[PDB]
């Protein structure tokens, strides 16, 4: 399921054998307000912030935007055809 980030998560998580009814900052340098979707947030590893999530839209385009980039690339080094 990898990491679950612009994703709800009102529910409490399980985090450091602590319980959180709300958005907690806890485990970050940064202060962060960060929520976990699962009950238990040590095994699954599913987390995600309590924002807008400005910065996960960014990551994913970005994700897809390199994922293009590298089919075109190899499109482009696998055959000398003009049309390719």
Do not use: V
């Not at 990491?3 to 709800?8: F, R, Y």
């Not at 009102?10 to 979707?37: N, Q, V």
């Not at 690339?73 to 696998?78: A, F, Q």
């Amino acid at each position: 399921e990898g990491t679950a980030h612009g994703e709800p998560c009102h529910f409490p998580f399980l985090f450091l054998d602590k319980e959180y009814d709300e958005c907690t900052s806890d485990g970050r340098e940064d202060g962060r307000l960060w929520c976990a979707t699962t009950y238990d947030y040590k095994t699954d590893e599913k987390w995600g912030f309590c924002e807008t999530e400005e910065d996960a839209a960014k990551r994913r385009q970005m994700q897809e935007a390199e994922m293009i980039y590298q089919a075109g690339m190899k499109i482009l080094n696998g055959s000398n055809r003009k049309s390719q």
